[PDB]
Amino acid sequence: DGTIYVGSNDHYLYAINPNGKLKWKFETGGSVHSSPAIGQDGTIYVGSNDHYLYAINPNGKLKWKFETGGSVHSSPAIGQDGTIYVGSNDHYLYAINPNGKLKWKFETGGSVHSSPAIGQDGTIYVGSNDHYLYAINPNGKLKWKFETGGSVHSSPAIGQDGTIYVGSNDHYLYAINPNGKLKWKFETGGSVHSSPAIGQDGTIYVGSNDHYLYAINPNGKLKWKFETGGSVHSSPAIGQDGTIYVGSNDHYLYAINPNGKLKWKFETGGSVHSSPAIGQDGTIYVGSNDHYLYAINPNGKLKWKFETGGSVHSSPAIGQ
Ligand SMILES: [Cl-]
Ligand SMILES: [Cl-]
């Protein structure tokens, strides 16, 4: 099918066809910064600034909405049994059943902006504003928490071997072993809000507020760093040939070769905080602060752009 879903600061969740024409839009009560996740049956889940986690049917009609105590900026993750996990600015990590009833909630010490990741054994990992990376068991009990030096707004990535990687506002990219002990930390020049991505050879890519996209080896030593013109808050995506795509606050979507050299850059009208998604055909989709969702071909030329009513900070998801 190939529908592209993305939130906008104009309060809507958009469903766009691969040709750039609207399928439907669903109005929430507030800005949709959260990035949608798609369940096995096609349900689209997304948080809103209006405090709700939404479940929207493929036809664009509400399935249910679950009210948390504060804005849902965190992006949901879906477990093997269908449980939907999402953080809230009310300080909790929520686990919601597919029917929209609470499974459990776990209180952290601060707002949960970070988006959860799920391990192979069902462990749920998420950062908190309280400076910790949390590992929560499927039953909602704490497994462990790891203290960084600052707020963990970056969303964790899990390696093949179980290593958990996450940025911190203390400027480091952390690699944490499955037991919750530090493996290594890599110092960038500024806060690491960007969420890491792991390449096929284990290279970890992450943006930094210091304007660079970093490639770090599994041993925690620098592979390369590529300088953009502004802070890299967007989270990288990796194509089949190894190309790394990431937005920058300098307004460009970047395509970087595995060797750290520029492949191409595409200029949007505003900062690219949204994190790119790659379609089956290689199309790269990303939002911009200029209000558009962009579809860029593998050669870096514009396929189409779709104007929403406000900034597109949400990161797109592509349906089957
Ligand atoms: Cl159409
Ligand atoms: Cl974000």
Coordinates of C-alpha atoms and ligand atoms in Angstrom, one line a residue:
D1 CA 0.0 0.0 0.0
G2 CA 2.7 2.6 0.9
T3 CA 0.8 5.3 2.7
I4 CA 3.0 7.9 4.4
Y5 CA 1.8 9.0 7.8
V6 CA 3.1 12.1 9.6
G7 CA 2.0 14.6 12.3
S8 CA 2.0 18.3 11.9
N9 CA 2.1 21.2 14.3
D10 CA -1.2 22.2 12.8
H11 CA -2.8 19.4 15.0
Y12 CA -3.4 16.9 12.3
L13 CA -2.1 13.4 11.6
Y14 CA -1.7 13.2 7.8
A15 CA -2.1 10.1 5.6
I16 CA -0.5 10.9 2.2
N17 CA -0.5 8.6 -0.9
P18 CA 2.8 7.7 -2.6
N19 CA 1.9 10.2 -5.3
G20 CA 1.8 13.1 -2.9
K21 CA -2.0 13.5 -2.8
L22 CA -3.9 13.5 0.4
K23 CA -5.6 10.3 1.5
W24 CA -7.0 11.7 4.8
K25 CA -6.2 13.9 7.7
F26 CA -7.2 13.4 11.3
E27 CA -7.6 16.4 13.6
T28 CA -6.3 16.0 17.2
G29 CA -6.6 18.7 19.8
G30 CA -3.1 19.9 19.6
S31 CA 0.3 19.8 17.8
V32 CA 1.3 16.3 16.7
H33 CA 5.1 16.2 17.3
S34 CA 5.1 12.5 18.1
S35 CA 6.0 10.2 15.3
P36 CA 3.5 7.5 14.3
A37 CA 3.8 3.8 14.6
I38 CA 1.9 1.3 12.6
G39 CA 0.5 -1.9 14.1
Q40 CA 0.2 -5.3 12.4
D41 CA -3.5 -4.7 11.6
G42 CA -2.7 -1.3 10.2
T43 CA -3.7 0.8 13.2
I44 CA -1.7 4.0 13.4
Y45 CA -0.7 5.2 16.8
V46 CA 0.6 8.7 17.6
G47 CA 0.8 11.1 20.5
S48 CA -0.5 14.6 20.6
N49 CA 0.3 17.8 22.5
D50 CA -3.4 17.5 23.7
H51 CA -2.2 14.8 26.2
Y52 CA -3.7 11.8 24.3
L53 CA -2.2 8.7 22.7
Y54 CA -4.4 8.2 19.5
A55 CA -5.2 4.9 17.8
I56 CA -6.5 5.7 14.3
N57 CA -7.9 3.1 11.9
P58 CA -6.5 2.8 8.3
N59 CA -9.6 4.6 7.1
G60 CA -8.8 7.7 9.1
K61 CA -11.5 7.3 11.8
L62 CA -10.7 7.2 15.5
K63 CA -10.3 3.8 17.1
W64 CA -9.6 5.1 20.6
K65 CA -7.7 7.8 22.4
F66 CA -6.0 7.3 25.8
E67 CA -5.6 10.4 28.0
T68 CA -2.3 10.8 29.8
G69 CA -1.5 13.6 32.3
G70 CA 0.5 15.7 29.8
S71 CA 1.7 16.2 26.3
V72 CA 2.6 13.0 24.4
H73 CA 5.8 14.0 22.5
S74 CA 7.3 10.6 22.7
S75 CA 6.8 8.3 19.7
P76 CA 5.1 5.0 20.4
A77 CA 6.7 1.5 20.0
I78 CA 4.7 -1.7 19.5
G79 CA 5.6 -4.9 21.2
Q80 CA 5.3 -8.5 19.9
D81 CA 1.9 -9.0 21.7
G82 CA 0.6 -5.7 20.4
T83 CA 1.2 -3.6 23.6
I84 CA 1.8 0.1 22.7
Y85 CA 4.5 1.9 24.8
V86 CA 4.8 5.6 24.9
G87 CA 6.2 8.3 27.2
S88 CA 4.4 11.3 28.4
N89 CA 5.4 14.7 29.7
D90 CA 3.6 13.7 32.9
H91 CA 6.8 11.6 33.7
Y92 CA 5.3 8.2 33.0
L93 CA 6.1 5.5 30.5
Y94 CA 2.7 4.0 29.5
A95 CA 2.0 0.5 28.3
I96 CA -1.4 0.4 26.7
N97 CA -3.3 -2.7 25.5
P98 CA -4.5 -2.9 21.8
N99 CA -8.0 -2.2 23.1
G100 CA -7.0 1.2 24.6
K101 CA -7.0 0.1 28.3
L102 CA -4.0 0.6 30.5
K103 CA -1.7 -2.4 31.0
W104 CA 0.6 -0.5 33.4
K105 CA 2.3 2.9 33.8
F106 CA 5.8 3.4 35.2
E107 CA 6.7 6.7 36.9
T108 CA 10.1 8.2 36.1
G109 CA 11.5 11.3 37.8
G110 CA 10.8 13.6 34.9
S111 CA 9.1 14.1 31.5
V112 CA 9.5 11.2 29.1
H113 CA 10.2 12.8 25.7
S114 CA 12.4 9.9 24.5
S115 CA 10.7 7.2 22.4
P116 CA 10.9 3.6 23.7
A117 CA 12.7 0.7 22.1
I118 CA 11.9 -2.9 22.7
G119 CA 14.5 -5.6 23.1
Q120 CA 14.2 -9.2 22.0
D121 CA 13.2 -10.4 25.5
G122 CA 10.6 -7.7 25.7
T123 CA 12.6 -5.2 27.9
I124 CA 11.5 -1.7 27.2
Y125 CA 14.2 1.0 27.1
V126 CA 13.5 4.7 27.3
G127 CA 15.2 7.9 28.4
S128 CA 13.8 10.5 30.9
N129 CA 14.3 14.2 31.5
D130 CA 15.5 13.0 35.0
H131 CA 18.9 12.1 33.3
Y132 CA 18.4 8.3 33.4
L133 CA 18.1 5.6 30.7
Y134 CA 15.4 3.2 32.0
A135 CA 15.1 -0.6 31.3
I136 CA 11.6 -1.8 32.2
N137 CA 10.5 -5.4 32.3
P138 CA 7.4 -6.4 30.3
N139 CA 5.5 -6.6 33.7
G140 CA 6.1 -2.9 34.3
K141 CA 8.8 -3.4 37.0
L142 CA 12.2 -1.6 36.9
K143 CA 15.0 -3.8 35.6
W144 CA 17.6 -1.1 35.9
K145 CA 18.3 2.6 35.4
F146 CA 21.5 4.2 34.2
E147 CA 22.4 7.7 35.2
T148 CA 23.8 10.0 32.5
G149 CA 24.9 13.6 33.2
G150 CA 21.9 15.3 31.7
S151 CA 18.4 14.8 30.3
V152 CA 18.0 11.8 28.0
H153 CA 15.8 13.1 25.1
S154 CA 17.4 10.9 22.5
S155 CA 15.6 7.6 21.8
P156 CA 17.6 4.4 22.3
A157 CA 18.7 1.9 19.7
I158 CA 19.4 -1.8 20.4
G159 CA 22.2 -3.6 18.7
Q160 CA 22.3 -7.2 17.5
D161 CA 24.2 -8.2 20.7
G162 CA 21.8 -6.3 23.0
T163 CA 23.9 -3.2 23.4
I164 CA 21.7 -0.1 24.1
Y165 CA 22.9 3.2 22.5
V166 CA 21.4 6.5 23.5
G167 CA 22.4 10.2 23.4
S168 CA 22.3 12.5 26.4
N169 CA 22.1 16.3 26.7
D170 CA 25.5 15.9 28.6
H171 CA 27.0 15.7 25.0
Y172 CA 27.8 12.0 25.1
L173 CA 26.6 9.0 23.1
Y174 CA 26.3 6.1 25.6
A175 CA 26.7 2.4 24.9
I176 CA 25.1 0.4 27.8
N177 CA 25.4 -3.4 28.2
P178 CA 22.3 -5.5 28.7
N179 CA 23.1 -5.6 32.4
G180 CA 22.8 -1.8 32.7
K181 CA 26.6 -1.1 33.1
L182 CA 28.5 1.4 31.0
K183 CA 30.3 -0.1 28.0
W184 CA 31.6 3.2 26.8
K185 CA 30.6 6.9 26.3
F186 CA 31.7 9.0 23.3
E187 CA 32.0 12.7 23.8
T188 CA 30.6 15.0 21.1
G189 CA 30.9 18.8 21.1
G190 CA 27.3 19.3 22.2
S191 CA 24.0 17.8 23.4
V192 CA 23.0 14.6 21.6
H193 CA 19.2 14.9 21.1
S194 CA 19.4 12.9 17.9
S195 CA 18.5 9.2 18.2
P196 CA 21.1 6.7 17.0
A197 CA 20.9 4.3 14.1
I198 CA 23.0 1.1 13.7
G199 CA 24.5 0.1 10.4
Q200 CA 24.9 -3.5 9.1
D201 CA 28.6 -3.5 10.2
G202 CA 27.7 -2.2 13.7
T203 CA 28.6 1.4 13.1
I204 CA 26.5 3.7 15.2
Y205 CA 25.4 7.0 13.6
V206 CA 24.0 9.9 15.6
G207 CA 23.7 13.7 15.2
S208 CA 24.9 16.2 17.7
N209 CA 24.0 19.8 18.6
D210 CA 27.6 20.6 17.6
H211 CA 26.5 20.4 13.9
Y212 CA 28.1 17.0 13.1
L213 CA 26.7 13.7 12.1
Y214 CA 28.9 11.2 13.9
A215 CA 29.8 7.6 12.9
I216 CA 31.2 5.7 15.8
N217 CA 32.7 2.2 15.7
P218 CA 31.3 -0.5 18.0
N219 CA 34.4 0.0 20.2
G220 CA 33.4 3.6 20.9
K221 CA 36.2 5.1 18.8
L222 CA 35.4 7.7 16.1
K223 CA 34.9 6.4 12.6
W224 CA 34.2 9.8 11.1
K225 CA 32.3 13.0 11.7
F226 CA 30.5 15.0 8.9
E227 CA 30.0 18.7 9.5
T228 CA 26.6 20.2 8.5
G229 CA 25.8 23.9 8.7
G230 CA 23.7 23.6 11.9
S231 CA 22.6 21.4 14.8
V232 CA 21.7 17.8 13.9
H233 CA 18.6 17.0 15.9
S234 CA 17.1 14.8 13.3
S235 CA 17.7 11.0 13.7
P236 CA 19.5 9.2 10.9
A237 CA 18.1 6.5 8.6
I238 CA 20.2 4.0 6.7
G239 CA 19.5 2.8 3.2
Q240 CA 20.1 -0.6 1.7
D241 CA 23.4 0.5 0.1
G242 CA 24.6 2.0 3.4
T243 CA 23.7 5.7 2.6
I244 CA 22.9 7.6 5.8
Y245 CA 20.2 10.2 5.6
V246 CA 19.7 12.9 8.2
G247 CA 18.2 16.4 8.5
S248 CA 20.0 19.4 9.8
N249 CA 18.8 22.7 11.3
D250 CA 20.6 24.3 8.4
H251 CA 17.5 23.4 6.3
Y252 CA 19.0 20.5 4.4
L253 CA 18.3 16.8 4.2
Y254 CA 21.7 15.1 3.9
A255 CA 22.7 11.9 2.2
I256 CA 26.1 10.7 3.4
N257 CA 28.1 7.8 2.0
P258 CA 29.3 5.1 4.3
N259 CA 32.8 6.6 4.0
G260 CA 31.6 9.9 5.5
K261 CA 31.7 11.9 2.3
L262 CA 28.7 13.8 1.0
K263 CA 26.5 12.1 -1.5
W264 CA 24.0 14.9 -1.9
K265 CA 22.1 17.5 0.1
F266 CA 18.6 18.8 -0.6
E267 CA 17.5 22.3 0.6
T268 CA 14.1 22.6 2.2
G269 CA 12.7 26.0 3.3
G270 CA 13.4 25.5 7.0
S271 CA 15.1 23.4 9.7
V272 CA 14.8 19.7 9.2
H273 CA 14.2 18.3 12.7
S274 CA 12.0 15.5 11.4
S275 CA 13.8 12.1 11.0
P276 CA 13.7 10.5 7.5
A277 CA 11.9 7.3 6.5
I278 CA 12.9 5.2 3.5
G279 CA 10.3 3.6 1.3
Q280 CA 10.5 0.3 -0.5
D281 CA 11.5 2.0 -3.7
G282 CA 14.2 4.1 -1.9
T283 CA 12.1 7.3 -1.7
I284 CA 13.2 9.4 1.3
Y285 CA 10.4 11.1 3.2
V286 CA 11.0 13.9 5.8
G287 CA 9.2 16.8 7.3
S288 CA 10.5 20.4 7.5
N289 CA 9.9 23.4 9.7
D290 CA 8.7 25.0 6.5
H291 CA 5.4 23.1 6.9
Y292 CA 5.9 20.5 4.1
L293 CA 6.4 16.8 4.0
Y294 CA 9.1 16.1 1.4
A295 CA 9.5 13.1 -0.8
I296 CA 13.0 12.9 -2.3
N297 CA 14.2 10.4 -4.9
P298 CA 17.3 8.3 -4.3
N299 CA 19.2 10.8 -6.6
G300 CA 18.4 13.7 -4.3
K301 CA 15.8 15.4 -6.6
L302 CA 12.4 16.4 -5.4
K303 CA 9.6 14.0 -6.1
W304 CA 6.9 16.0 -4.4
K305 CA 6.2 18.2 -1.4
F306 CA 2.9 18.3 0.5
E307 CA 2.0 21.5 2.4
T308 CA 0.5 21.1 5.8
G309 CA -0.7 24.0 8.0
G310 CA 2.4 24.1 10.2
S311 CA 5.8 22.7 11.0
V312 CA 6.3 19.0 10.3
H313 CA 8.6 18.0 13.2
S314 CA 7.0 14.5 13.4
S315 CA 8.9 11.8 11.7
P316 CA 7.0 9.9 8.9
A317 CA 6.0 6.2 9.0
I318 CA 5.3 4.2 5.9
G319 CA 2.5 1.6 5.8
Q320 CA 2.6 -1.7 4.1
Ligands
CL1 CL -4.6 9.8 -5.4
CL2 CL 12.2 14.4 18.7

